């Protein structure tokens, strides 16, 4: 199966009420395995998955030290971008960074990512060849010139094609039971009578891992794309996800409808029908 390791970082300025908030998290596929929070008591990188807990003190001290360097670098960036954008020192602002890597079923490199956003918009991003940058505006161009000169991309390329892949793999083989599973969805339908002439028909997918699913209704073979209330896939809280798609059926027409479920763990897609 394809796998991905991603790291997500947020710095938010707290003008007047201190030092910014820095939160770092890390994910292998849909499983979070680490975190650092600026406002936390410990000032260490902490496990958020049991399979990373028995890494050595060497790993935790090593990861703590690196994330704390990250933390410092972004609280420098909050100042720099406020200058680049000529903002007031009073307002609260946000930098986000995300980087990581994707492997194929073969566990060899597919793609590396490296991107920033100031206040919810793309600031700068390493392009897919991992050689060039996409600098949004003039300030992101100042930043691009800097990282061009200091050969930051060649060094980044080496983390994402090497030591990111190596870690992802390790994590996969060390967290094998969590990370290399496919929980197929448990599906079922419900029928609620909205009125004497109308009823909701909801198709549930529950306990599936990974988060990817297509839950789709149909009437006599035709897509029901505008007529379906589809919710956003949500965590159940135990490491699986949930999702439902619902349609309001004109009474007596229940047989016309089919719910279609596609997920990694289904040998074949399901077609469910109320009957």
């Amino acid at each position: 199966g394809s796998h991905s390791m991603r790291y997500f970082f947020t710095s938010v300025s707290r003008p007047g009420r201190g030092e910014p908030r820095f939160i770092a998290v890390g994910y292998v596929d849909d499983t979070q395995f680490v975190r650092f929070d600026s406002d936390a008591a410990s000032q260490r990188m902490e496990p958020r998955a049991p399979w990373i807990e028995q890494e050595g003190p060497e790993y935790w001290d090593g990861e703590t030290r690196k994330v704390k360097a990250h933390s410092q670098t972004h609280r420098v960036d909050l100042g720099t971008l406020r200058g680049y954008y000529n903002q007031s020192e009073a307002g609260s602002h946000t930098v986000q960074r995300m980087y990581g890597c994707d492997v194929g079923s073969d566990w060899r490199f597919l793609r590396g990512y490296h991107q920033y956003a100031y206040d919810g918009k793309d600031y700068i991003a390493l392009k897919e060849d991992l050689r060039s940058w996409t600098a949004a505006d003039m300030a992101a161009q100042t930043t691009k010139h800097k990282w061009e000169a200091a050969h930051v991309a060649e060094q980044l390329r080496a983390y994402l094609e090497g030591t990111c892949v190596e870690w992802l793999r390790r994590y996969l083989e060390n967290g094998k039971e969590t990370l290399q599973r496919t929980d197929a969805p448990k599906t079922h339908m419900t029928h609620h009578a909205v009125s004497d002439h109308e009823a909701t028909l909801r198709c549930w997918a529950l306990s599936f891992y990974p988060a990817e699913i297509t839950l789709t209704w149909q009437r006599d073979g035709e897509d029901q794309t505008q007529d379906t209330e589809l919710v956003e896939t949500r965590p159940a809280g135990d490491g699986t996800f949930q999702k439902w798609a619902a349609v309001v059926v004109p009474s007596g027409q229940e047989q016309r409808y089919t719910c279609h479920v596609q997920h990694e763990g289904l040998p074949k897609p399901l077609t469910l029908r109320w009957e």
Binding site: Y7, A24, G26, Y59, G62, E63, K66, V67, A69, H70, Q72, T73, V76, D77, T80, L81, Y84, V95, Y99, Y116, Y123, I124, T143, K146, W147, A150, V152, Q155, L156, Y159, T163, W167
Partner: peptide, 9 residues
């Protein structure tokens, strides 16, 4: 495991 180096904007 994260990046061993940092660089500022």
């Amino acid at each position: 495991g994260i990046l061993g180096f940092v660089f500022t904007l």
